[model samples]
Target: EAYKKAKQASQDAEQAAKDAENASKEAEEAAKEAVNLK
Candidate 1:
């Protein structure tokens, strides 16, 4: 049971990092759009 929980936690962390990377990409795109408007 302990090992299963540890595995699940690692998966969750990896997914969270993926999510952060996507968010950063979206933010960068938005900033670029804003800059284009100026």
Candidate 2:
């Protein structure tokens, strides 16, 4: 049971990390577009 909990925690962490990375990339693109418009 402990091992299963650890495995699930690791998977959750990985998913959260990927989401954060994608969000940063999208924010960067938005910034670029705003600069181009100005």
* Best candidate (score: lDDT): 2
- What is the C-alpha local distance difference test score of candidate 1? 0.74
Clashing pairs in 2: none
In the range 1-38, model 2's lDDT, one tens digit per residue, is 65545665676789988998897678877567556776
**Distance from true location, Cα of 21 in model 2, Å:** 1.1
Local error of candidate 1 at residue 18 (angstroms): 0.6
TM-score of each: 0.46, 0.47
Model 2 TM: 0.47
lDDT per residue (tens digit) for residues 1-38 in model 1: 65444665676789888998897778887467556766
Please report the TM-score between candidate 1 and the true structure: 0.46
